């Protein structure tokens, strides 16, 4: 077929730049952070919505 469209959407996309945030965490302190998020001080709250990264 016609090869003329190649990289159409890759070059058509509006170029948004990545926003600067802090250095994340690494290693044992990251595992401590995600253990503290999920297990100790889990929220007595709207259960069965146990879908972190729930949009709305």
């Amino acid at each position: 077929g016609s090869l003329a469209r190649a990289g159409k959407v890759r070059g058509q996309t509006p170029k948004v730049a990545k926003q600067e945030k802090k250095k994340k965490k690494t290693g044992r302190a990251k595992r401590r952070m995600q253990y503290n998020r999920r297990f100790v001080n889990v929220v007595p709250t709207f259960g069965k919505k146990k879908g972190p990264n729930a949009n709305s």
Partner: peptide, 29 residues
């Protein structure tokens, strides 16, 4: 409501996602 969204969209393209969400609601932790 996962019940209604499953009972409506079990047939559509979003069936696997609403079944995932319904089992999440039913089983729970």
């Amino acid at each position: 409501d996962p019940y209604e969204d499953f009972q409506e969209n079990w047939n559509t393209k979003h069936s696997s996602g609403v079944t995932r969400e319904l089992m999440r609601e039913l089983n729970g932790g």
